PDB file of C-alpha atoms and ligand atoms in Angstrom:
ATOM      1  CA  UNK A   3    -169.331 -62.264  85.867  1.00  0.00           C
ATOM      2  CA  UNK A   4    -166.616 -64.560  87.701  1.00  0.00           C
ATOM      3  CA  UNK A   5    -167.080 -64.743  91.517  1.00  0.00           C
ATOM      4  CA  UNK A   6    -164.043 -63.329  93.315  1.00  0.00           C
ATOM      5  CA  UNK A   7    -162.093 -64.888  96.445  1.00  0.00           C
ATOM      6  CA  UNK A   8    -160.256 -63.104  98.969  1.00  0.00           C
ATOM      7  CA  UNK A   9    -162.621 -60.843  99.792  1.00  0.00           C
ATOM      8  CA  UNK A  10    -163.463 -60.790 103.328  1.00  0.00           C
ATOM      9  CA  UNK A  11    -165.759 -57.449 105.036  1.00  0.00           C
ATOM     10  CA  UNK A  12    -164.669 -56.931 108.394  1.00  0.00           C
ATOM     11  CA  UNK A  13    -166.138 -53.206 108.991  1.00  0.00           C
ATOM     12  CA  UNK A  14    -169.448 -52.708 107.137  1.00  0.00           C
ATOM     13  CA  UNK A  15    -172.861 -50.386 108.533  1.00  0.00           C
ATOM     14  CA  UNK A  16    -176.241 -51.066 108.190  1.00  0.00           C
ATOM     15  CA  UNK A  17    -178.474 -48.213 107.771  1.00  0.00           C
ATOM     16  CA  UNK A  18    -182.128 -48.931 107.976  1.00  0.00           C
ATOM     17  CA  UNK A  19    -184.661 -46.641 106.117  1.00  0.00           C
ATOM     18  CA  UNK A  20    -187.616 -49.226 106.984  1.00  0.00           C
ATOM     19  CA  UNK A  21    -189.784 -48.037 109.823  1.00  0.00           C
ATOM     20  CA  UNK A  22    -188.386 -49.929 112.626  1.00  0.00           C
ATOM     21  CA  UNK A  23    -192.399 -50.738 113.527  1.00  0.00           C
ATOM     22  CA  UNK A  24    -192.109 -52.943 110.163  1.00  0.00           C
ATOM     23  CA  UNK A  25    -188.198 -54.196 110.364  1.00  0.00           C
ATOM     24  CA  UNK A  26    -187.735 -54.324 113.810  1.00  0.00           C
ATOM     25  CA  UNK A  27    -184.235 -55.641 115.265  1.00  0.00           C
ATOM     26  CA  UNK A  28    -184.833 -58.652 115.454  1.00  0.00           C
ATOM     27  CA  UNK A  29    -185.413 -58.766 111.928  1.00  0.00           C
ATOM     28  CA  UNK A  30    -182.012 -57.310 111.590  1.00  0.00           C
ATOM     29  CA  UNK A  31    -179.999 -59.490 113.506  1.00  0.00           C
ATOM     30  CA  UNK A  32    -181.757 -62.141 112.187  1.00  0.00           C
ATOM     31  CA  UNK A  33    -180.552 -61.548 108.296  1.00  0.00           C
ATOM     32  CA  UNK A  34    -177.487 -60.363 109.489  1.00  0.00           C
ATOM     33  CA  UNK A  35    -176.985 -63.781 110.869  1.00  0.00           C
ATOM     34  CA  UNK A  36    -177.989 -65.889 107.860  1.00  0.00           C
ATOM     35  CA  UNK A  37    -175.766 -63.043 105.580  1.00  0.00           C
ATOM     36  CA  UNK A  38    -173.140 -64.217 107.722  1.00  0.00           C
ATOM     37  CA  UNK A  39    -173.331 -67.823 107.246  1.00  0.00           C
ATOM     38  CA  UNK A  40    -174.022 -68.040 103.443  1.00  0.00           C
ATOM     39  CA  UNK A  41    -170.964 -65.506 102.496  1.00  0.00           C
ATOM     40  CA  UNK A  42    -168.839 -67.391 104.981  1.00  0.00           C
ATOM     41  CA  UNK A  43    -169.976 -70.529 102.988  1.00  0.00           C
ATOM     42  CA  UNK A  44    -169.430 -68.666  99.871  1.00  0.00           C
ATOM     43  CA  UNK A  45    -165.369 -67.835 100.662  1.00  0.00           C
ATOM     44  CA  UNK A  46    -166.539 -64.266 100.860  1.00  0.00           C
ATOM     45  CA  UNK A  47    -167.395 -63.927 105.037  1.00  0.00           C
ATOM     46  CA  UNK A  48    -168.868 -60.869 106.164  1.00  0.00           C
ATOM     47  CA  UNK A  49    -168.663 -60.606 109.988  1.00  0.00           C
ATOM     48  CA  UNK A  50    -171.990 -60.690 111.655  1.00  0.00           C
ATOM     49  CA  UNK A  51    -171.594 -57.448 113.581  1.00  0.00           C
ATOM     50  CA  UNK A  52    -171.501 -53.889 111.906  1.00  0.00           C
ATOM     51  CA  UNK A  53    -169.940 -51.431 113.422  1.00  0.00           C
ATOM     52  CA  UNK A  54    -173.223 -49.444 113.203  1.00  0.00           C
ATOM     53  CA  UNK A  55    -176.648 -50.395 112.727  1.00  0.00           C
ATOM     54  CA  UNK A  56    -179.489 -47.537 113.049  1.00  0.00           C
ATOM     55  CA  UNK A  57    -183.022 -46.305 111.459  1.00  0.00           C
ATOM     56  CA  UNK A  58    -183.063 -42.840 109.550  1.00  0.00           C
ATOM     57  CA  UNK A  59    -186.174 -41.411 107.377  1.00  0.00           C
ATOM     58  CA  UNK A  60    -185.955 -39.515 104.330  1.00  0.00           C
ATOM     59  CA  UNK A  61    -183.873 -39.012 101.346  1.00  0.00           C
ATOM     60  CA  UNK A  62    -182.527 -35.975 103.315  1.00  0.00           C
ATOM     61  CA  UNK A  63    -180.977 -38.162 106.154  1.00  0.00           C
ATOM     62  CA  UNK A  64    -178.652 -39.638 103.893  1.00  0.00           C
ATOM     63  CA  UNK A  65    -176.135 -37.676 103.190  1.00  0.00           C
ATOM     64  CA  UNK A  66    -175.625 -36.636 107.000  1.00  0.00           C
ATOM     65  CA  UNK A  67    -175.661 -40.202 107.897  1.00  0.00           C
ATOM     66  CA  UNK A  68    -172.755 -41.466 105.527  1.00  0.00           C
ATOM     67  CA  UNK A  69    -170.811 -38.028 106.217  1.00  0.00           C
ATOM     68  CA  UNK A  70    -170.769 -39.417 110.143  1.00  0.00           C
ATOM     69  CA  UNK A  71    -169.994 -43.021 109.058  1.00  0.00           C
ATOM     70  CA  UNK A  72    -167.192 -41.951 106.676  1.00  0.00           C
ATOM     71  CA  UNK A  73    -165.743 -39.879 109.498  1.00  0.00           C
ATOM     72  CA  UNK A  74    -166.559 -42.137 112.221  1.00  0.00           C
ATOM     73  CA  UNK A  75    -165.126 -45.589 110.768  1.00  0.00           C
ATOM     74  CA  UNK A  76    -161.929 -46.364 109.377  1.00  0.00           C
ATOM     75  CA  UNK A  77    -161.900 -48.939 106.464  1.00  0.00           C
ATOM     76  CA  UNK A  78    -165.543 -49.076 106.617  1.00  0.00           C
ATOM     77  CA  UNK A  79    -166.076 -51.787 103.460  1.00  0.00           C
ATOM     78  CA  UNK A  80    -169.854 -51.504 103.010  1.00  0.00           C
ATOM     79  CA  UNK A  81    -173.084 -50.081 103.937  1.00  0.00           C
ATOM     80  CA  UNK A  82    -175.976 -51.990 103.390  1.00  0.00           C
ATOM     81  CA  UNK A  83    -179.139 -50.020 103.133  1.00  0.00           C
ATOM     82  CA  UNK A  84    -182.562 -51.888 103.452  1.00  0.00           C
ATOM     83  CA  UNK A  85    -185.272 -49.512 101.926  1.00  0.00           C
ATOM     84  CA  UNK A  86    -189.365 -50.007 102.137  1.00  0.00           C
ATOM     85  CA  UNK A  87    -190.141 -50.631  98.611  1.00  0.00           C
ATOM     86  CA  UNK A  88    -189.633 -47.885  95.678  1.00  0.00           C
ATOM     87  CA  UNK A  89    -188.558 -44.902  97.377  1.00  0.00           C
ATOM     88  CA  UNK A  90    -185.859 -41.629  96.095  1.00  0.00           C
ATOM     89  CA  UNK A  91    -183.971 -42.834  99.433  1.00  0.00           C
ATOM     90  CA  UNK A  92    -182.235 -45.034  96.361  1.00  0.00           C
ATOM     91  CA  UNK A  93    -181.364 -42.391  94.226  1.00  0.00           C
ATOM     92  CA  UNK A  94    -179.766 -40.045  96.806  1.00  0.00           C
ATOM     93  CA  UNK A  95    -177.905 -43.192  98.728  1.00  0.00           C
ATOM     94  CA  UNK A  96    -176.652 -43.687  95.485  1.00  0.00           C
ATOM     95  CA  UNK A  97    -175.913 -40.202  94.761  1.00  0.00           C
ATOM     96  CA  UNK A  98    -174.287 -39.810  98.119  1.00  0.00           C
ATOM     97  CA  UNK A  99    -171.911 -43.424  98.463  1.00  0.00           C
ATOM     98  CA  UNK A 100    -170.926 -43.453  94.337  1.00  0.00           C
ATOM     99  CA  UNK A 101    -170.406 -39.689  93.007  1.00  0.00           C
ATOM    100  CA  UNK A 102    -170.072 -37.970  96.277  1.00  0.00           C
ATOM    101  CA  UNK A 103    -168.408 -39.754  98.856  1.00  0.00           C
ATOM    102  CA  UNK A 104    -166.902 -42.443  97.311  1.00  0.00           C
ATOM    103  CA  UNK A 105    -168.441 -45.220  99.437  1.00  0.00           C
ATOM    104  CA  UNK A 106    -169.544 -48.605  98.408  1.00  0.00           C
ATOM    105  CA  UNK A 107    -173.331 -49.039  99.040  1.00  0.00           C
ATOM    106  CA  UNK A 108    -175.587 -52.406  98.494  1.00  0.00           C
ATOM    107  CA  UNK A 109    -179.579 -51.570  98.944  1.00  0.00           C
ATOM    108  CA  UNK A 110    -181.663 -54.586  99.358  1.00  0.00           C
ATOM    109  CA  UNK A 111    -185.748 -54.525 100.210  1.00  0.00           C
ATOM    110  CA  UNK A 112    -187.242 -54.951 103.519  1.00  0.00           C
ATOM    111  CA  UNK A 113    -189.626 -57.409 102.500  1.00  0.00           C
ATOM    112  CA  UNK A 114    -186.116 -59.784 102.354  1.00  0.00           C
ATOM    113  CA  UNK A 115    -184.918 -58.797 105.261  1.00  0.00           C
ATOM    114  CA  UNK A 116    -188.084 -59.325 107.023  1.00  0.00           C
ATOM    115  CA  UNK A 117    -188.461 -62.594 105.211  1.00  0.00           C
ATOM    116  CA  UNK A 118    -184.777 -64.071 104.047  1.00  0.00           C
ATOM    117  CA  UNK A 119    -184.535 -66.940 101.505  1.00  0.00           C
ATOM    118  CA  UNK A 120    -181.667 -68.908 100.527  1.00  0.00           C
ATOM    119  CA  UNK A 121    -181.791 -67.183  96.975  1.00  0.00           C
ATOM    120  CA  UNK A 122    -182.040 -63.349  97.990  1.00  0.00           C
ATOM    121  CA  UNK A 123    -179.389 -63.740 100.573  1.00  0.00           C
ATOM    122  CA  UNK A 124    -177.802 -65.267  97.285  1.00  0.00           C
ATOM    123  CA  UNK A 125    -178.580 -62.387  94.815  1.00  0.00           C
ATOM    124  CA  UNK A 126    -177.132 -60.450  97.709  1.00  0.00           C
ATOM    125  CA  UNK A 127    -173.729 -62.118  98.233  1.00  0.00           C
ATOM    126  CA  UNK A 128    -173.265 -62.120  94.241  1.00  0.00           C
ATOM    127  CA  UNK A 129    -174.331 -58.367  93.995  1.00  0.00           C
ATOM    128  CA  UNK A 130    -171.779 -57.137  97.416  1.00  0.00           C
ATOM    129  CA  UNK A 131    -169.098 -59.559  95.213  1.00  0.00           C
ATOM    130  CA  UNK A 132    -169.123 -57.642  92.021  1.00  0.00           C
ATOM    131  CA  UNK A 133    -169.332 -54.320  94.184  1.00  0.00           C
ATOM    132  CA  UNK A 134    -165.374 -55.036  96.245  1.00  0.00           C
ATOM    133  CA  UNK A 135    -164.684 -58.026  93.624  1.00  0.00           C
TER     134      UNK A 135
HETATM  135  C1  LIG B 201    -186.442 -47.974  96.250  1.00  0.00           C
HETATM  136  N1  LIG B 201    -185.558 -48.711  95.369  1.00  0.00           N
HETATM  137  C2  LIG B 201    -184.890 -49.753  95.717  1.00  0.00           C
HETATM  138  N2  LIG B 201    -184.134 -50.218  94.685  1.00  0.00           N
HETATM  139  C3  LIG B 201    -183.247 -51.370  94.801  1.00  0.00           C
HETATM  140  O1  LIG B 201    -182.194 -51.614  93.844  1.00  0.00           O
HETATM  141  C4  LIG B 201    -181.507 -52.454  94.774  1.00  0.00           C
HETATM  142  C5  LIG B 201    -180.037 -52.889  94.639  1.00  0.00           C
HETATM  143  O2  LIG B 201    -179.189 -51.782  94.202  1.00  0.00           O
HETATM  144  P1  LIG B 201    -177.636 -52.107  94.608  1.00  0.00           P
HETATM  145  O3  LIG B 201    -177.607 -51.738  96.048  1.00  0.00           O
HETATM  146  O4  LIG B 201    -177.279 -53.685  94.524  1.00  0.00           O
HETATM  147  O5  LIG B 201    -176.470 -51.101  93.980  1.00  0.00           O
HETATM  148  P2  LIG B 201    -176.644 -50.676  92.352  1.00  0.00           P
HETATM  149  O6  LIG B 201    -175.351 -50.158  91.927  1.00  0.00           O
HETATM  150  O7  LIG B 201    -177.684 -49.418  92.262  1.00  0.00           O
HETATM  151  O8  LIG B 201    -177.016 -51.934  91.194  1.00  0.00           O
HETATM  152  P3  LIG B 201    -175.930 -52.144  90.106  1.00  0.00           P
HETATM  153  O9  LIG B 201    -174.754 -52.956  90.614  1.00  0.00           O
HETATM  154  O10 LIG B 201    -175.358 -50.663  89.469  1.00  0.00           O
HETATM  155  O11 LIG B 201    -176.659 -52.663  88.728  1.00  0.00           O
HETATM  156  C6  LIG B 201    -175.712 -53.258  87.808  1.00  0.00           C
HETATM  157  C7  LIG B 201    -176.550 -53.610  86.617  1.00  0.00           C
HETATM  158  O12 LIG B 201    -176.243 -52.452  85.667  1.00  0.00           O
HETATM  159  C8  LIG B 201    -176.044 -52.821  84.200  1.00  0.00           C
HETATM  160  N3  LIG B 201    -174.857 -52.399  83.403  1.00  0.00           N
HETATM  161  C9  LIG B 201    -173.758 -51.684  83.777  1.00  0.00           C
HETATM  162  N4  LIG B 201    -172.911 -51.624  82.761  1.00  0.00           N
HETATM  163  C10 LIG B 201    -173.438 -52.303  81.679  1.00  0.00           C
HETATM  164  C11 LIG B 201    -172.995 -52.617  80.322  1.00  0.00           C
HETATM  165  O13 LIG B 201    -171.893 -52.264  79.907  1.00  0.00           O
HETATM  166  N5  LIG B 201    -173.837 -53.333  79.498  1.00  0.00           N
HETATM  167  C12 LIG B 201    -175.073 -53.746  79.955  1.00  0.00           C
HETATM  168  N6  LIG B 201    -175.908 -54.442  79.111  1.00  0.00           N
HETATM  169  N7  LIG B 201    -175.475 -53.485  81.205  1.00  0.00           N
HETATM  170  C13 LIG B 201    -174.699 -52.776  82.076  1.00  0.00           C
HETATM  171  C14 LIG B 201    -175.526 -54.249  84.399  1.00  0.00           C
HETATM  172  O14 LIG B 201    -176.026 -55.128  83.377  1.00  0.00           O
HETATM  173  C15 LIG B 201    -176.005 -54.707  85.747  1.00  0.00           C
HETATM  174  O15 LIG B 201    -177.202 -55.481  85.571  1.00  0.00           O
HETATM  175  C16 LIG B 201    -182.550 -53.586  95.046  1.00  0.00           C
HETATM  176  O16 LIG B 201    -182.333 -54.301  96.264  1.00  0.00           O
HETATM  177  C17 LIG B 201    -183.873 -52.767  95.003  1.00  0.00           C
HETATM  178  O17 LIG B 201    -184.645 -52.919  96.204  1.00  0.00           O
HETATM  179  C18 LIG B 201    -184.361 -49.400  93.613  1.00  0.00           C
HETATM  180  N8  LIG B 201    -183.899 -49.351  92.330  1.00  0.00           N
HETATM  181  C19 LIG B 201    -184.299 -48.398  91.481  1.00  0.00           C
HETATM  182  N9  LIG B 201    -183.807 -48.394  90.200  1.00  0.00           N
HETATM  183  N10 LIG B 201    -185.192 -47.413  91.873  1.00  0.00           N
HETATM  184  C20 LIG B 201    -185.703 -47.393  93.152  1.00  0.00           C
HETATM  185  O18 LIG B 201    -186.487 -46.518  93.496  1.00  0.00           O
HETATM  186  C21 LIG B 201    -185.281 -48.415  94.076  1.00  0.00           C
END
């Protein structure tokens, strides 16, 4: 599909369902940082500091979490969940941010957060594009 100008996330979350032990924070400021830079480069910035950036575990920690970031942040844009490999975390963040809440959600692995590349932070962009294109 077409890529889409104008767009520009100014209040976005990151909700980490990674054991912090594996994607520490370091790891998260770090692909925060190089999100920043390629979307900026891209036309579509995303400012490199969410208003909320914290570790959960279990399916059953989503809903509560996006209930206090839906009530906590006004014009929150995005939430970018980073999940440890094939896990029904998906299904319910999905469940939760699409036919419950009504907020737009872009999962990515932890094994390209812990490890970005030029491409994935690519897929990324284009996927979060499509999502508030
Ligand atoms: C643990 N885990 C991680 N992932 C994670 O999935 C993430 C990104 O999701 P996302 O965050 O980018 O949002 P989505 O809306 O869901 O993708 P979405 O935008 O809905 O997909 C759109 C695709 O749907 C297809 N589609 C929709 N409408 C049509 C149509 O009319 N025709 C055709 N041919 N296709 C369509 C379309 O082609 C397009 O390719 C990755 O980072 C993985 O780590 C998991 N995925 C699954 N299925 N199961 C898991 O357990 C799992």
């Amino acid at each position: 599909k077409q890529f889409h100008t104008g767009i520009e996330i100014k209040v976005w979350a990151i909700a980490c369902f990674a054991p912090q032990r594996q994607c520490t924070e370091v790891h998260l400021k770090s692909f925060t940082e190089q999100l920043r830079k390629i979307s900026r480069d891209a036309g579509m910035p995303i400012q490199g500091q969410p208003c909320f950036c914290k570790y959960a575990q279990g399916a059953d920690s989503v809903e509560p979490m996006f209930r206090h970031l839906k009530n906590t942040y006004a014009g929150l844009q995005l939430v970018v969940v980073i999940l440890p490999g094939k896990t029904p975390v998906y299904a319910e963040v999905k469940r939760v941010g699409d036919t419950v809440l009504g907020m737009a959600t872009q999962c990515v692995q932890m094994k390209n957060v812990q490890r970005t590349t030029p491409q994935t932070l690519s897929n990324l962009c284009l996927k979060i594009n499509v999502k508030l294109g």
